[PDB]
Amino acid sequence: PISPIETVPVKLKPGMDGPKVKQWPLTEEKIKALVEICTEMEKEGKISKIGPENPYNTPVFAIKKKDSTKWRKLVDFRELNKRTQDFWEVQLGIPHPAGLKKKKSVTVLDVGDAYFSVPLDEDFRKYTAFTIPSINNETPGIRYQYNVLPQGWKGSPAIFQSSMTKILEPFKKQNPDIVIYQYMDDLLVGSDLEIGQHRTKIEELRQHLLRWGLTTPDKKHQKEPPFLWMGYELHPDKWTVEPIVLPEKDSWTVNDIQKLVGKLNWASQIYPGIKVRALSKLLRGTKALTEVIPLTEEAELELAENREILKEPVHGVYYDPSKDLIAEIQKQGQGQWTYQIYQEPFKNLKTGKYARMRGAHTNDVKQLTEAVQKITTESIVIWGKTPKFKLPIQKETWETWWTEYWQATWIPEWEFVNTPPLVKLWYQLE
Amino acid sequence: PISPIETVPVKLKPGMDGPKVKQWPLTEEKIKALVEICTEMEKEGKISKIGPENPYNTPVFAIKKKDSTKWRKLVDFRELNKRTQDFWEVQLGIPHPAGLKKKKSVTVLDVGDAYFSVPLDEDFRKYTAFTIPSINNETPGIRYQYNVLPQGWKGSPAIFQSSMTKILEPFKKQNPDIVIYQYMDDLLVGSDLEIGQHRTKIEELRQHLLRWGLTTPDKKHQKEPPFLWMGYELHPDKWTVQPIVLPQKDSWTVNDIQKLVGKLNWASQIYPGIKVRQLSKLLRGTKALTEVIPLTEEAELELAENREILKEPVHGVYYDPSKDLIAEIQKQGQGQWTYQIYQEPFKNLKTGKYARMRGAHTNDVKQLTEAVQKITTESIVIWGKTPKFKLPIQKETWETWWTEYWQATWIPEWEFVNTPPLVKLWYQLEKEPIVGAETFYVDGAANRETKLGKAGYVTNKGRQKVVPLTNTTNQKTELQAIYLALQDSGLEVNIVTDSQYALGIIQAQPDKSESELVNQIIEQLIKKEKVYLAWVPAHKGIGGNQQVDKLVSAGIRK
Numbered sequence A: 001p002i003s004p005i006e007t008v009p010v011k012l013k014p015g016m017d018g019p020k021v022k023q024w025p026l027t028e029e030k031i032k033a034l035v036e037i038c039t040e041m042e043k044e045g046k047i048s049k050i051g052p053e054n055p056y057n058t059p060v061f062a063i064k065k066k067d068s069t070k071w072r073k074l075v076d077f078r079e080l081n082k083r084t085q086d087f088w089e090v091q092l093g094i095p096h097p098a099g100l101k102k103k104k105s106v107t108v109l110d111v112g113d114a115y116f117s118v119p120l121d122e123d124f125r126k127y128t129a130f131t132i133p134s135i136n137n138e139t140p141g142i143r144y145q146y147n148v149l150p151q152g153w154k155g156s157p158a159i160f161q162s163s164m165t166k167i168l169e170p171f172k173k174q175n176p177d178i179v180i181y182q183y184m185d186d187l188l189v190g191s192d193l194e195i196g197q198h199r200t201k202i203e204e205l206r207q208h209l210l211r212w213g214l215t216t217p218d219k220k221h222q223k224e225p226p227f228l229w230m231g232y233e234l235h236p237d238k239w240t241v242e243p244i245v246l247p248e249k250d251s252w253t254v255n256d257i258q259k260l261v262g263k264l265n266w267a268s269q270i271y272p273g274i275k276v277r278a279l280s281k282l283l284r285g286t287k288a289l290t291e292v293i294p295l296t297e298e299a300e301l302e303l304a305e306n307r308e309i310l311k312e313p314v315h316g317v318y319y320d321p322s323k324d325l326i327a328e329i330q331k332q333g334q335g336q337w338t339y340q341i342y343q344e345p346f347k348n349l350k351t352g353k354y355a356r357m358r359g360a361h362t363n364d365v366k367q368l369t370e371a372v373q374k375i376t377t378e379s380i381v382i383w384g385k386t387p388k389f390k391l392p393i394q395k396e397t398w399e400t401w402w403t404e405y406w407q408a409t410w411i412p413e414w415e416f417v418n419t420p421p422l423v424k425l426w427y428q429l430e
Numbered sequence B: 001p002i003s004p005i006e007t008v009p010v011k012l013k014p015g016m017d018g019p020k021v022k023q024w025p026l027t028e029e030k031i032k033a034l035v036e037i038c039t040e041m042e043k044e045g046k047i048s049k050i051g052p053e054n055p056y057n058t059p060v061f062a063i064k065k066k067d068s069t070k071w072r073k074l075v076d077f078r079e080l081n082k083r084t085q086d087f088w089e090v091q092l093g094i095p096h097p098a099g100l101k102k103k104k105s106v107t108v109l110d111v112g113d114a115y116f117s118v119p120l121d122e123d124f125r126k127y128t129a130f131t132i133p134s135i136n137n138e139t140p141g142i143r144y145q146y147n148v149l150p151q152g153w154k155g156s157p158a159i160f161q162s163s164m165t166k167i168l169e170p171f172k173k174q175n176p177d178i179v180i181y182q183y184m185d186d187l188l189v190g191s192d193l194e195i196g197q198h199r200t201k202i203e204e205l206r207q208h209l210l211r212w213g214l215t216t217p218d219k220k221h222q223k224e225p226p227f228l229w230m231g232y233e234l235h236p237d238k239w240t241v242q243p244i245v246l247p248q249k250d251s252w253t254v255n256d257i258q259k260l261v262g263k264l265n266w267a268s269q270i271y272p273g274i275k276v277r278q279l280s281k282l283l284r285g286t287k288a289l290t291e292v293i294p295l296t297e298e299a300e301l302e303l304a305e306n307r308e309i310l311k312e313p314v315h316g317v318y319y320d321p322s323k324d325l326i327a328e329i330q331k332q333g334q335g336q337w338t339y340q341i342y343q344e345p346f347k348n349l350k351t352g353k354y355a356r357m358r359g360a361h362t363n364d365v366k367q368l369t370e371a372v373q374k375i376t377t378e379s380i381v382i383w384g385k386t387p388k389f390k391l392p393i394q395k396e397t398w399e400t401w402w403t404e405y406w407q408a409t410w411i412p413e414w415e416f417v418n419t420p421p422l423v424k425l426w427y428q429l430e431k432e433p434i435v436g437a438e439t440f441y442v443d444g445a446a447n448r449e450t451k452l453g454k455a456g457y458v459t460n461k462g463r464q465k466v467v468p469l470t471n472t473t474n475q476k477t478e479l480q481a482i483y484l485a486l487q488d489s490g491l492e493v494n495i496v497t498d499s500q501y502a503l504g505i506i507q508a509q510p511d512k513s514e515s516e517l518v519n520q521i522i523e524q525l526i527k528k529e530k531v532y533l534a535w536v537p538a539h540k541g542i543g544g545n546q547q548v549d550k551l552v553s554a555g556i557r558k
């Protein structure tokens, strides 16, 4: 019932050992969902039980991706990639098409079921050993190894890259303006077409995708108020900056102006050539804050000059491929957050406001987790790498609820914020 | 009595080799106790004499733990344990009694000397080589190997747990609803079949096993009900802990104190109402297990208050997968809170406490929520379910510290109840500055090598003041400076702050503290009708600046 294809040898980077991670215990509903998965797939020759001679480990979750009906498996191969793939980033790079961002709209498909067909290197497999949790630590965890290419791993599409190219070929030359990035289990597809044309130009790719190898794009169905019909289309041409809003009428009171200089004071390390004295002078005196004190003659200049450094910055925009982007977010109103992806402090690379409605489920953590992805597919689309996320949240609260609103494959790296920030004030970028 | 089961494959850590030693020459009396010993061990086929041809070796200990009749031996696979490959550790903790179920009848089988039967991989055995030399080096090479998983041996416990699992696999398949658990050397068999109808399966078990290479001397079903499980004390329908006798002295060292501190905690799964707080607060000066310490009156207060509950024994019920799982949290004060998890009202499932410590200046609502998790996290670690929450916090005060706080937060199915220490917001600040209210441009400072500072203010109506301070922090000080500022204001005030630090502290609205200073402010805040703060860049321009930091001048040059 089997047809042994052959393998591309995966080996251990800079003398390292394989990941020995710990499995976050989880829901029973979910501890069930994973046996109901792993066994039917153990049947399918994909996975296999191992003995004790194997100490390696790795996280397994359980999501319901497209909606609510059936579960999805997921793995935090984050230590294996952090292991192998910083050599299989070389030996097996998959290059980032920088016109990626340049395109009108980017859709993405789980063309990831597709690597189950590739056998994995027998001698390596030990490093894909995962485990499934038992309620209350009773029964010894249900332990499996990976026989094929794990849908999680970063070293997988590395390999299947080949077949990906070969399988796309006829498509690429039928439609050449379209580019495609094979990131993760992600087939990033963009075009300069109408929201109706790129939409079709896509299915065209889906069809092709069934035929030529019964590789498969999972059915697009869900209906959120932002009318998500068919297509998870990010529109990169929408990339304009409008965060740091100076209050229109706030140069009235001592207070307003007392705000106005502090804000101007953060900006000072961002646009260093900032001039704000003759404004500050307006408040050099111990005065009542509700005192409508108008501005000085020479002060308007400092507001005006600095008020035009905004519409045109320079040398920030410099990305370093030998360093790692960091995203950091912060909460604001009921559904408006903010992120700043820098790499070396204050040197902003990309910024934005994670919005959402006023009458909507104001669940912080829905926003935060859902905010996070929105960061990420863009950070892929643009740099093709994952930001260290500096998170406004309890370790243990996140380590307890992300797995709930995480309708995504890759699990970007993360950290959690100790001290509060002033930044939030009003839309501000660190 | 060697087993006939699929052994497990072990190599030593790549690169490393098996150990080679030569043991300390021993006499007549030590060797006799060992020859005799190895022979009938070899007899049970547990070991096999090999020849000169085996390179590696290790030593033997021919101990006598208590001074009882049967001599015994042991080998410290010290060096081997260094070498041998790594395993998937089985000691992944323990299951927690709370969350266990009520399985009518139950028995435990001692699988103690049930490893020696499990066979070693056929290739590693050479490594486990040991030599039995004589008194007069007449027979230098009396050496034996080791066919089964030896005592200690890194993998032993790792493997035996695995083998046994595959062993009860069909039985657990034929006799489904009975349920086996295993750890160390204790086998717990359980069902909901009447004693004799229960003893069947146990005996069946006692036999099935016997067919696989391993014996189980247990007898007529073996041991029942009074269970000393990993310390825990368990009964067919209830659990708790048993020997827990925290004493007292007239001169303790941190040494014994640690212990005292442990017990109290341990006893905290069950006994409603325990705290360790003060007994541990004092522990801080972490010197050696030789230094003694003055048990304070605050500590003994608790040392005694806690013994009362702990004086008279509390019981623990079992989990019932259908019944509601739930918990509500009471505050024990001093940032300490106590949670109780229950299904049937007043039926104690589990209890424990959350004490926000080793990191001062913390808000209450926040702490409420912090513990909720302690629970959420723990309720899954056991019931794999989320407790419905009975919590002492109004909705409108929540909806606010939900949407007030920065660090995003989340709380599942929570419901409101009454209880004296109700939590909520004592005060809040202002968003827009106050009309007509007085505007106080505060300031502080300190002698960066001379210990002193000056706190004070100047209002907009020309209201000045200062207060010379000593043995104070540039922080404490700029903090203290707001207290004055506070004090000398009527009802609705405006404060303009020099400092980030304190501005931040007063932004969060926490409460209690050993720092009477911070507290003293709290109360001011608490009493005021409308408090508005504002903040500005220190060295830069703190408004009236020139005058402000200038009237507080002493020693500075800038």
Ligand SMILES: COc1ccc2c(c1)N(C(=O)OC(C)C)[C@@H](CSC)C(=S)N2
Residues within 6 Å of the ligand: B095, B097, B100, B101, B102, B103, B106, B107, B179, B180, B181, B188, B189, B190, B191, B225, B227, B229, B234, B235, B236, B237, B318
């Ligand atoms: C008085 O002893 C007990 C009372 C209740 C339970 C147990 C023992 N349990 C157990 O394995 O004991 C230790 C290892 C935790 C298991 C089934 S034991 C056949 C369960 S679900 N409830």
